[PDB]
Amino acid sequence: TCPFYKKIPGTGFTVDAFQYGVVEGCTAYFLTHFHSDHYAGLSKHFTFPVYCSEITGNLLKNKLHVQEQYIHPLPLDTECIVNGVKVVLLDANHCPGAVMILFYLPNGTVILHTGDFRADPSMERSLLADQKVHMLYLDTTYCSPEYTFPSQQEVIRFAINTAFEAVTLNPHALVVCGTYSIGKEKVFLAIADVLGSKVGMSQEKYKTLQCLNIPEINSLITTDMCSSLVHLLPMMQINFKGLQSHLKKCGGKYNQILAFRPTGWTHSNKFTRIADVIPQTKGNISIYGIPYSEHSSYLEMKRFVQWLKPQKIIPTVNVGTWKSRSTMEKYFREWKLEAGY
Ligand code: NI
Numbered sequence: 001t002c003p004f005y006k007k008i009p010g011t012g013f014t015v016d017a018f019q020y021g022v023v024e025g026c027t028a029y030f031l032t033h034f035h036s037d038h039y040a041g042l043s044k045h046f047t048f049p050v051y052c053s054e055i056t057g058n059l060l061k062n063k064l065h066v067q068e069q070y071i072h073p074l075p076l077d078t079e080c081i082v083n084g085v086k087v088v089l090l091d092a093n094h095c096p097g098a099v100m101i102l103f104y105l106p107n108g109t110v111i112l113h114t115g116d117f118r119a120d121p122s123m124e125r126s127l128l129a130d131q132k133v134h135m136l137y138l139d140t141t142y143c144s145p146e147y148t149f150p151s152q153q154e155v156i157r158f159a160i161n162t163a164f165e166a167v168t169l170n171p172h173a174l175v176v177c178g179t180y181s182i183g184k185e186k187v188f189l190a191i192a193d194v195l196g197s198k199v200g201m202s203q204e205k206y207k208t209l210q211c212l213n214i215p216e217i218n219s220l221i222t223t224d225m226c227s228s229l230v231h232l233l234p235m236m237q238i239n240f241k242g243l244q245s246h247l248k249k250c251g252g253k254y255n256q257i258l259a260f261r262p263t264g265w266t267h268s269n270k271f272t273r274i275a276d277v278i279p280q281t282k283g284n285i286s287i288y289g290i291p292y293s294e295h296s297s298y299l300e301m302k303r304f305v306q307w308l309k310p311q312k313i314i315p316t317v318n319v320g321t322w323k324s325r326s327t328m329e330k331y332f333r334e335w336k337l338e339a340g341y
Contacts, residue, residue: 032115033098055097058211092117095183119296119304136310173256178238200228262292309341
């Protein structure tokens, strides 16, 4: 049964609520982004209307084989009417096709559902600027002060320089990058670009990346592993056994692997600067964990909320414990008092 925080009151709408069968009174199902925790339950047998972005629509049709007639893509930054309710989709600065959703309720309430997001000051000059928000359904993944990490730009810089150094020292080194879902594509795209290679991957991943409207994509990726010196593998295989095995497959083309695991946050952020990061090494294999996040830091989250000044905040992540709920309400109150709303 559907939790209250996936219901938009005063409408027939839910958000990211596909794992509860037929939700009583829901006449349209919104999907914020193609991550499995959020799409859990969708398949080709789904017969209610789904509303999402164009990219999310591509993946529904091609990967989950949902039927065309039930997929309703909407343009971003465009006031649209759905079952008599004005809505807007906004870029969530998360993974490709990921959106925030504004609901303008009949009674005059305004609701923002962030989906998954990484807050940015650029959001302060969207169609959010023009009016008040009464309720915020907030991605609270890292709502605690200890969750710090760098900008995406600094991390990519670290990765690019690391990889270019290693391959210029050893032309026979291979670079590997782990993956298990969409998002974080810049990590492998940037590395392949500075090395002047295409990124090589399995057919199922190539199919997925083909759904994402990246410009010039056919120039950047390929299924021919033999022609590329940047390979993507499942995240699970990014370890000393998985990598030794894969090196064997390359038939003595390469004598060294440099691999990258893009995590979210790790406790090595409480002490170490991005510049200071070092690999785990075994023989001719090195592994870097790099903190490339597609969720708000604590400070980025605080800044957005303090800018938005909502009247009520409803968390969508870390809701399952009392300790977590309690902690989050404290920070909300602090933020409210500090900025005076
Ligand atoms: Ni997500």
